Design a protein around this nucleic acid. Structure first.
Ligand SMILES: [Mg+2]
Ligand SMILES: [Mg+2]
Ligand SMILES: [Mg+2]
Ligand SMILES: [Mg+2]
Ligand SMILES: [Mg+2]
Ligand SMILES: [Mg+2]
Ligand SMILES: [Mg+2]
Ligand SMILES: [Mg+2]
Ligand SMILES: [Mg+2]
Ligand SMILES: [Mg+2]
Ligand SMILES: [Mg+2]
Ligand SMILES: [Mg+2]
Ligand SMILES: [Mg+2]
Ligand SMILES: [Mg+2]
Ligand SMILES: [Mg+2]
Ligand SMILES: [Mg+2]
Ligand SMILES: [Mg+2]
Lengths: 258, 227, 945
RNA sequence: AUUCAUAAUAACUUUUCGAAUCGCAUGGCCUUGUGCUGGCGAUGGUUCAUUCAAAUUUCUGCCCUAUCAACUUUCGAUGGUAGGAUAGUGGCCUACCAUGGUUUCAACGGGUAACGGGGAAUAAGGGUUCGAUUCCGGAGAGGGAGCCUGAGAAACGGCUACCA
RNA sequence: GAAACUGCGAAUGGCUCAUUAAAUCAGUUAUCGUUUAUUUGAUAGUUUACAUGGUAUAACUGUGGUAAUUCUAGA
């Protein structure tokens, strides 16, 4: 190619969007934004294919141009705005607030939240560095640059960002016994407690996570997101509480509830 | 060859066909920007001075300044040059153009009357063509009317009458770079925004300094305890 | 913005401003014919809408309201029993002022009133107070849809409680006074419409009580709110009026004409009438028109005589005369008003009648119309007449106003002779009023004023003013005016050898009195001090034109050969009219002399006549260039040369850029005719801005004549015509000030534009050699630093200075000028200027001196001035032991230049990073210089201190 | 893990940037001035970070051919030094230096009806064959060569030569 | 609101498999070795002003050349 691509075939689109393979030939390409392409849910798919509010792309554009959709407390109008992990989607007319969280199956789940819990978000500190004029700043997983951080905040910590002011309200250190959420890999969507961090200089760090059912799994450190202390999450978790269930047990539960 | 003579002070312009070759020969060997005497061309042009501006040959190709030849040549023309209008950004095209030396094979020669002779040409000197459009920018209006700074350009805008059937009205330009309260409001708003941002940054810096000082004092106290 | 979205774009979605939505919004629920949910009902209106709004609105606040009230609204008996809690919750939730729940709540509040309306009456006061606070809150958060909900909620309540509110409207109005009186126009406009619907539903008896109350209140924005209220009640559909309009309109009139009602109420009625008159067509107004005539006829009385006339004035003016069905009726009223007041109001009335009346009716009444004016408006008939002329002068002339004016003058010339003079003065310029000037004037007044000059004392400006206003009337005198004038002019000339501005105008008036030789001799004896005045110049123009050439004249002008050349000095004046009249005077004098008028004179007259427009912009330039060529080729005498050169500089005074083009092209090629004459003309123009020119004119004794001529009207159209009439009255109220004020207006223009110096400088630039030869006269400005002047009164502009310095460089031999050395030092001062452009001009003139050493290093100095090459030149040109360094022998001449040029660069504001390094470089080169030169550089810095 | 982030000192610059832009609306202070102050947005702009990307890049893996056994090095092949160029590392190129680099564990040369892969067929299993072709990546626009523009092109429904 | 200037896009998409045998490509690394329009978040009291020029032109008016082209010359 001679430049950046602007099209996305349906088959090449991220699996977890759950797009029909025969509805069309192309899929929404998320525009550049806070989140990466493969780890983002564009607003069109959220409003049309998940909430079923809009029947087709044109109605989604009609919704957005009315300025009813807010992402992280700011109005967005791009149909392909890449909403992602820990972003708050507010629809005032419906009096609805959503937080985008992966369910156990690894897909973004429609999770309804109260307004108070919608007042803030959580961000993984991706970088801590001194800016120009000797001003420290922190860059989070969603690309927010926050100046004058608390000095104790280090990389891989979690910061609770208030959306109204864009400032850090509190922070959680990455330590053993903390509650964490998996945001990548085959263990995507699971929740557990840290047990031990293996360090490999010049390589990818590994973290052992024990679930509430005492099952253990190892995951690369880049895919871990600290969300609180054990039993005291700082956000409301989706149904299932991040517990992975075997196929047989899922069958049993499904038959029972039916 | 035909002579397209233009009088810029009137803004007038007219074509004269030529048959006798004495005048045509005195045009020969000249160059764009050079001046020739009209009396040599003919009695009707006695006392006139003609500056050569360009021409077209029997094949229609134009004459280009800067190329000193009597024959056509294929030149690579680019943005902001005569004889070529680029269709696409950065497009450069090689086109045939006629040289800047007058020759026998010019179909038409363009002339500008630098100085008027004793006799008045019927179609050029005796007639006038008005300017199509008047000044638009405020300073241009002041310059045209020689207004003082205090005098408002608003009252000196040229108006043109348009009549449609039985109805009639006037049209006038939108002045640009006019001092209006909206512009003052915008300027003031920018200045206030700038000052407020500066003050907020200073406040944040002071708060961070206090936090760092408190942490430092606590750490030093702990170190003293360890000792 | 005026040009509204009248032409609609093809776009489906388009932005609309909050103001735009408010403007098109209108509070009138009945018009909306869309199906309403509550129209279909099973239990109650409240329940039907309540279930629907549960479905549509999902707002949090409305949801909580629904849960609290869901159980108590299932059946109509349930609603009635629990009404107290229902109303409390509705008011409680509405108070939060949440938009997302406001719509269901406001609707349910209306439907709540629908279910239990008579029972709502105990809730009625609380509801309106809740709505008023909501609307007042809505002003802060701009949402047009909120206002639509609230006012419709108000309208619906107003619809359902129509019978009971109609009984106590003044109470209901009292609640809405804050809305009707509110500062924002739209809130008053909306509240007026909602309240208006009750007004239409009134019994007539109840309405009269309501109309009395509001008029009592009337004695901020209440006037405007009431005006919208009543006019809205009158209008129902386009070009039609409501059936009840006649009943309401009668009630308003009867209260308005009542003595108890305040006068502003009648003003309101006038405004109400005009709104409906404009809105409605002819047929719809006929029932309304009839009631107005009958009521006026029935209630005519001395006490209400003024009020009735005020309304009639509105009727005749309203939409001119087209809405009026039959003017015979209005005429039949007018004598009844006349037979049974305020003169100014009457004058206002008849003038519109003349303008607006159909031809037939005016003819029947034109004679009786003006006889009334002589009856009672005779105190101010002329104020009426001038207003009548301005409205329709042709109709007045067609209908024999002129003879009635002639009759008027005979009756009252003794009383208000000055006021007559003001009228004939103002109408003089108007060509359409030539018939008025033709009106013969009463003879007895002429003799009485004629006797005045025959024995008049003229020793002070006040006596001159007595002559002046009298002098205007003699122009129509036919009793051999010339004989009386000549002794008076001699008295005036001898008494005031040095005229002031007022005197010059009087003599012009006096010369104007003349109609078809001794007088010509009189003016020639004393004219040098009056050539400047336009009015004198016109009066002289009238005299010479009337008089026929003869041999005796040729003797007369021969006695004063300098007459022609003296008048030529008027062509440098800033006024076009003065120049034109002077030219016309010049031609006539030559005819009297018998001398041939040069063709150049005729051509210049044509140019002055051409209008100054873009269309004619080019044509002007060629005429200047053609006549300039005509002047150049043709050899002429001094008078022609003096005429043309002065006329050219007169064109420079013109404020038309194309005109400047021709003269700037013409002048450089014709100045050889008179090198001395052009130079003085250029020299004078340079000194004009410094020269102080003031117009001092006689101030007449102040007249404290002013009064509220007419009433004030809200509507712009009527208010404008009132302003025009009042302006006329005030003008005639102070006749002394008005006469002088009119006079100063027509004198002309004597203040040269402040840019005239720049124009002269351009002439100087085009011809450097003349400036070089006459440097003696231009030298002092430079040594003053171009400052009038230790505090400075004024200085030249930077543009003027720049053109001057450029001219100096153009001098072929600057070294041999009158004062080369003193000039040479001052240019060194300019070479030290901070402005780099000034230094280049200063250097160029310095290089104009032929000095070999400077010529050797000229380019290096120029590069030092150039900003781009300043830095490298410092290293190469000035480094000690440098190859390109100044030789030791040549240092002494060059270093003073080098020291001064660097000084200005140190004065650059050391503000930007490139500009800061520039200052460091300037100071860093000092060590290269020898210590004596460093001492010189330090000396320059302290010289200003 | 750094000459990292950042800061400071002395200078330098055909040297930048630091709002001369636009819509809607008319609030607040008064010494009442078309005085002062002021809201909601659009579009621009230095630097940092993020995102879509781009470039180069480490390790391992390709069918037939030994009746192709030596190849590369003069005209860069291996490496050092310094410079030029590049967005940047680098024989990428230049100047001076050394004589290096790969190979029977198959280099080099030749054939390929050779775009590579996810995949498709058969088979009990090992294997054998196919994959221009719905997705990913690469290259091309008749064949070579060379460029303007622009963040992004050696573009071809952009341009210039030559060949046909 | 035509035309034109200005900004943006036209380097995406679509087609084909000619060349290409450690080349492409697959998996896996690195940029402490570099550019990055745009989006997102930060970020600039230190720079006649009730606001500067043509150091300028398009569209447009008007006069024209060529057999011809998304050709264009003078004013
Ligand atoms: Mg690493
Ligand atoms: Mg363009
Ligand atoms: Mg228009
Ligand atoms: Mg070499
Ligand atoms: Mg190197
Ligand atoms: Mg092939
Ligand atoms: Mg194959
Ligand atoms: Mg394939
Ligand atoms: Mg290509
Ligand atoms: Mg082909
Ligand atoms: Mg190509
Ligand atoms: Mg293409
Ligand atoms: Mg091969
Ligand atoms: Mg490889
Ligand atoms: Mg863009
Ligand atoms: Mg940005
Ligand atoms: Mg031109």
């Amino acid at each position: 190619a001679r430049g950046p691509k602007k099209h996305l075939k349906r088959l090449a689109a991220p699996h977890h969007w759950l797009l029909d393979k025969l509805s069309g030939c192309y899929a929404p390409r998320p525009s550049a934004g806070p989140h990466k392409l493969r780890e983002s849910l564009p607003l069109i798919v959220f409003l049309r294919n998940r909430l079923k509010y809009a029947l087709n792309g044109r109605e989604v554009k009609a919704i957005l141009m009315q300025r009813h959709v807010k992402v992280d407390g700011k109005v967005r109008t791009d149909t392909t705005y890449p909403a992602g992990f820990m972003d708050v989607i507010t629809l005032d007319a419906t009096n609805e607030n959503f937080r985008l969280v992966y369910d156990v199956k690894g897909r973004f789940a429609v999770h309804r939240i109260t307004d108070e819990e919608a007042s803030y978000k959580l961000g993984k500190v991706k970088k801590v560095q001194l800016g120009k004029k000797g001003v420290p700043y922190v860059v989070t997983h969603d690309g927010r640059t926050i100046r004058y951080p608390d000095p104790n905040i280090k990389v891989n910590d979690t910061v609770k960002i208030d959306l109204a002011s864009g400032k850090i309200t509190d922070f959680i250190k990455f330590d053993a016994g903390k509650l964490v959420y998996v945001t990548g890999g085959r263990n995507l969507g699971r929740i557990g407690t840290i047990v031990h961090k293996e360090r490999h200089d010049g390589g990818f760090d590994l973290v052992h996570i024990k679930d509430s059912l005492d099952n253990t799994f190892v995951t690369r450190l880049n895919n871990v997101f600290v969300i609180g202390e054990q039993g005291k999450p700082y956000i409301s978790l989706p149904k299932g509480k991040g517990i992975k269930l075997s196929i047989a047990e899922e069958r049993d539960r499904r038959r029972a509830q039916q | 060859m035909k002579l397209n003579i233009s009088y810029p002070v009137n803004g007038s312009q007219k074509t004269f066909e030529i048959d006798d070759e004495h005048r045509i020969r005195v045009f020969f060997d000249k160059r764009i920007g050079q001046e020739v005497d009209g009396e040599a061309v003919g009695d009707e042009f006695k006392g006139y001075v003609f500056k050569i501006s360009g021409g077209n040959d029997k094949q229609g190709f134009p004459m280009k300044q800067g190329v000193l030849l009597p024959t056509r040549i294929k030149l690579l023309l680019t943005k902001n040059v005569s004889c070529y209008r680029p269709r696409r950004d950065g497009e450069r095209k090689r086109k045939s153009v006629r040289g800047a030396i007058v020759g026998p094979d010019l179909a038409v020669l363009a002339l500008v009357i630098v100085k008027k002779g004793e006799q008045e040409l019927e179609g050029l000197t005796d007639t006038t063509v008005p300017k199509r459009l008047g000044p638009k920018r405020a300073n241009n209006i002041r310059k045209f009317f020689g207004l003082s700074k205090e005098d408002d350009v608003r009252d000196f805008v040229i108006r043109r009458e348009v009549t449609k059937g039985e109805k009639t009205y006037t049209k006038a330009p939108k002045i640009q770079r006019l001092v209006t309260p909206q512009r003052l409001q915008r300027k003031r708003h920018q200045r206030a925004l700038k000052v407020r941002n500066a003050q907020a940054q200073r406040e944040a810096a002071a708060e961070y300094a206090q936090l760092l000082a408190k942490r430092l004092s606590e750490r030093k106290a702990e170190k003293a305890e360890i000792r | 913005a005026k040009q509204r979205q009248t032409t609609k774009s093809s776009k489906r979605y388009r932005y609309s401003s909050f103001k735009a939505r408010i403007d098109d919004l209108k509070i009138e629920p009945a018009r909306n014919l869309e199906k309403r949910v509550h129209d279909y009902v099973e239990s109650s209106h409240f329940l039907a809408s309540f279930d629907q709004w549960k479905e549509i609105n999902l707002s949090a606040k409305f949801t909580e309201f629904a849960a609290e009230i869901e159980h108590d609204v299932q059946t109509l008996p349930q609603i009635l029993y629990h009404d107290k809690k229902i109303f409390n919750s509705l008011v409680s939730f509405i108070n939060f002022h949440d938009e997302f729940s406001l719509q269901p709540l406001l609707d349910l509040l209306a439907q709540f009133c629908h279910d239990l309306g008579p029972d709502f009456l105990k809730f009625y006061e609380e509801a309106i107070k809740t709505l008023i606070n909501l609307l007042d809150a809505a002003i802060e958060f701009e949402s047009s849809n909120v206002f639509e909900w609230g006012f419709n909620c108000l309208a619906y309540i107003f619809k359902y409680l129509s019978k009971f509110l109609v009984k106590k409207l003044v109470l209901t109005c009292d609640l809405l006074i804050p809305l009707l009186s509110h500062s924002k126009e739209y809130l008053s406009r909306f509240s007026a419409e909602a309240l208006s619907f009750l007004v239409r539903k009134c019994p007539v008896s109840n309405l009269r009580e309501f109309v009395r109350s509001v008029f009592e209140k009337l004695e901020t924005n209440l006037y405007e709110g009431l005006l919208i209220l009543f006019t809205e009640s009158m209008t129902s559909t386009q070009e039609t009026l409501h059936s009840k309009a006649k009943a309401i309109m009668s009630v308003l009139l009867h209260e308005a004409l009542t003595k108890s009602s305040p006068e502003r109420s009648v003003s309101l009625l006038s405004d109400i009438w005009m709104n409906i008159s404009k809105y409605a067509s002819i047929e719809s107004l006929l029932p309304v028109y009839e009631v107005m005539y009958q009521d006026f006829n029935d209630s005519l009385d001395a006490t209400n005589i003024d009020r009735i006339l005020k309304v009639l004035t509105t009727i005749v003016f309203s939409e001119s005369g087209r809405k009026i069905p039959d003017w015979n009726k209005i005429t039949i009223l007018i004598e009844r008003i006349m037979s049974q007041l305020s003169q100014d109001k009457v004058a206002f009335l008849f003038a519109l009648f003349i303008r607006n009346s159909d031809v037939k009716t005016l003819t029947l009444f034109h004679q009786k119309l003006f006889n009334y004016a002589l009856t009672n408006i005779s105190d101010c008939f002329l104020e009426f007449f001038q207003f009548a002329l301005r409205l329709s002068y042709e109709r007045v002339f067609s209908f024999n106003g002129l003879k009635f004016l002639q009759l008027f003058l005979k009756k009252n010339w003794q009383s208000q002779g000055k006021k007559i003079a003001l009228f004939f003065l103002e109408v003089d310029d108007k060509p359409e009023l030539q018939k008025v000037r033709e009106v013969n004037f009463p003879e007895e007044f002429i003799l009485s004023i004629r006797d005045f000059f025959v024995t008049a004392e003229i020793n002070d400006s006040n006596d001159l003013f007595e002559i002046y206003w009298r002098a205007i009337i003699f122009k129509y005198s036919k009793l051999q005016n010339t004989e009386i004038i000549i002794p008076l002019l001699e008295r005036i000339f001898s008494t005031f050898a040095s005229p002031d501005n007022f005197t010059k105008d009087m003599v012009g008036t006096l010369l104007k009195i003349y109609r078809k030789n001794n007088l010509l001799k009189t003016i020639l004896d004393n004219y040098e001090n009056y050539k400047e005045s336009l009015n004198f110049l016109r009066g002289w123009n009238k005299l010479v034109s009337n008089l026929h050439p003869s041999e005796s004249l040729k003797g007369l002008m021969s006695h004063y050969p300098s007459l022609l050349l003296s008048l030529t000095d008027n062509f440098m004046l800033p006024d076009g009219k003065i120049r034109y009249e002077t030219l016309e005077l010049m031609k006539t004098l030559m005819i009297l002399q018998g001398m041939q008028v040069p063709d150049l004179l005729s051509s210049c007259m044509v140019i002055e006549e051409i209008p100054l427009t873009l269309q004619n912009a080019r044509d002007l330039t060629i005429r200047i260039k053609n006549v300039g060529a005509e002047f150049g080729k043709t050899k002429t005498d001094k008078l022609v040369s003096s005429f043309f050169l002065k006329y050219l500089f007169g064109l420079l005074t013109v404020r038309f850029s194309p005109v400047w083009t021709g003269v700037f092209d013409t002048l450089p090629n014709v100045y050889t005719k008179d090198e001395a004459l052009v130079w003085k003309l250029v020299l004078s123009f340079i000194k004009l801005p410094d020269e102080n020119q003031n117009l001092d004119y006689y101030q007449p004794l102040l007249e404290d004549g002013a009064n509220k001529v007419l009433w004030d009207s809200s509507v712009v159209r009527l208010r404008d015509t009132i302003d025009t009439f009042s302006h006329i009255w005030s003008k005639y109220s102070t006749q002394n000030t008005s006469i002088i004020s009119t006079t100063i207006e027509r004198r002309g223009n004597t203040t040269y534009p402040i840019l005239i110096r720049n124009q002269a400088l351009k002439v100087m630039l085009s011809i450097p050699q003349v400036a070089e030869n006459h440097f003696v006269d231009i030298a002092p400005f430079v040594y003053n630093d171009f400052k009038t002047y230790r505090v400075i009164t004024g200085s030249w502009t930077e543009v003027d200075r720049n053109v001057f310095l450029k001219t100096l460089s153009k001098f072929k031999n600057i070294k041999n000028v009158y004062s080369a050395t003193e000039l040479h030092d001052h240019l060194m001062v300019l070479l030290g200027s901070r402005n780099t452009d000034v230094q280049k001009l200063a250097l160029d003139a310095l290089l104009a001196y032929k000095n070999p050493t400077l010529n050797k290093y000229r380019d290096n100095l120029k590069n030092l001035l150039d900003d781009t090459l300043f830095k490298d030149e410092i290293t190469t040109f000035l480094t000690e032991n440098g190859s390109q360094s100044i030789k030791a022998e040549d240092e002494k001449v060059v270093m003073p230049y080098v020291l001064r040029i660097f000084f200005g660069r140190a004065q650059v504001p050391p503000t930007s990073g490139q500009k800061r390094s520039r200052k460091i470089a300037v100071i860093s080169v000092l060590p290269n210089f020898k210590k004596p030169y460093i001492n010189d550089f330090l000396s320059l810095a302290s010289e200003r201190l």
